[PDB]
Design a protein around this ligand. Structure first.
Ligand SMILES: *C1=C2C(=CC(=O)C(O)=C2C)[C@]2(C)CC[C@@]3(C)[C@@H]4C[C@](C)(C(=O)O)CC[C@]4(C)CC[C@]3(C)C2=C1
Ligand SMILES: *C1=C2C(=CC(=O)C(O)=C2C)[C@]2(C)CC[C@@]3(C)[C@@H]4C[C@](C)(C(=O)O)CC[C@]4(C)CC[C@]3(C)C2=C1
Lengths: 172, 171
């Protein structure tokens, strides 16, 4: 792929299901000026991914206080994403979302980020931290069965922002 | 770039390491088949953020041993540089005695194989890799230089891969 630490994160333009439940075409570059956590999950209607997606959505306000946009993505269609959102939470659905979910049906976004599992056409569990100038700061890739931690992601986002700011702090 | 791919054999290496007993030894990743491995890079010796990470992994090595997991650190510095840093007491800014081996990658080929060499600076990013007991790469972590890693998160990951190893085995 083309995701390199210290280089601009690969842009994308893709259809996402938005928190209001409608579809919108969004780009990574829409979020310049804010940190971005961009994470891939393999497929909709699976059993590890919902724990992660719901945790990032549930805790979205902790990312907003860090001026950080969270974006999820999978190769499944945006229609499939919405179907999972609309499945009742008590029956296994995602329920209402506080984060957008991108659809990568051509697999080009997962390829650009180096996380496509080529022999199956789905993404590994890749997570990327992109700073407010668009520069990639952190790469995380898990094999399919093992989920990610919102606590760890918050730790990293905050730590990068602190080290970003150290040199402009008042010298008193 | 690099040859580290999830679900494929982790790139092998053979390199001089400073072992916990203070001796040099040429070791290979394949020496540790039968154990999980946490293999982590740091940019260079005698720095500020890196010793806190290295000491944290060394101090907590028993928690990895209980998971049948070997921890190995690495940088492009010479094996003499590693040994001098170990022989510098922690209270004077050194590493002090270590419970983990520290690999020397002076030709930068290990960092290149793992995709973590920072071009034109000749140092590695803060890369960390989790390799299972069959030598297969399960997890990739790469931090830009300013931000360190968490032993807690690394243990959570090792535990989680070992958990999922307990179902779905075909052979
Ligand atoms: C941080 C602060 C400063 C004052 C201050 O009241 C304050 O609240 C904060 C947080 C000082 C000490 C004030 C003076 C400057 C800003 C100077 C002066 C300079 C001409 C300016 O006014 O912008 C240029 C910047 C410079 C040299 C650095 C910061 C600070 C020393 C300063 C930072
Ligand atoms: C599991 C598998 C094996 C191959 C394989 O392609 C595969 O998909 C799975 C799930 C191997 C590596 C194949 C060879 C055997 C089956 C051997 C050979 C043996 C003669 C047989 O054919 O059954 C006897 C069993 C033996 C020695 C152990 C398993 C495996 C090494 C194997 C398991």
């Amino acid at each position: 792929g083309n995701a390199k630490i210290g280089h601009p994160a690969p842009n994308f333009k893709a259809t996402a299901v938005m928190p209001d439940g409608q579809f919108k075409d969004i780009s990574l570059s829409d979020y310049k000026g804010k940190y971005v956590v961009f994470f891939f999950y393999p497929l909709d209607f699976t059993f590890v991914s919902p724990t992660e997606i719901i945790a990032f959505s549930d805790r979205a306000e902790e990312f907003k206080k860090l001026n950080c946009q969270v974006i999820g993505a999978s190769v499944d269609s945006h229609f499939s994403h919405l179907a999972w959102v609309n499945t009742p939470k008590k029956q296994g659905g995602l329920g209402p979302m506080n984060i957008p979910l991108v659809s990568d049906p051509k697999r080009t976004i997962a390829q650009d980020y180096g996380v496509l599992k080529a022999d199956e056409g789905i993404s590994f569990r890749g997570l990327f931290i992109i700073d407010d100038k668009g520069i990639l700061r952190q790469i995380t890739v898990n094999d399919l069965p093992v989920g990610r931690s919102v606590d760890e992601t918050l730790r990293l986002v905050q730590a990068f922002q602190f080290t970003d700011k150290h040199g402009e702090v008042c010298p008193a």
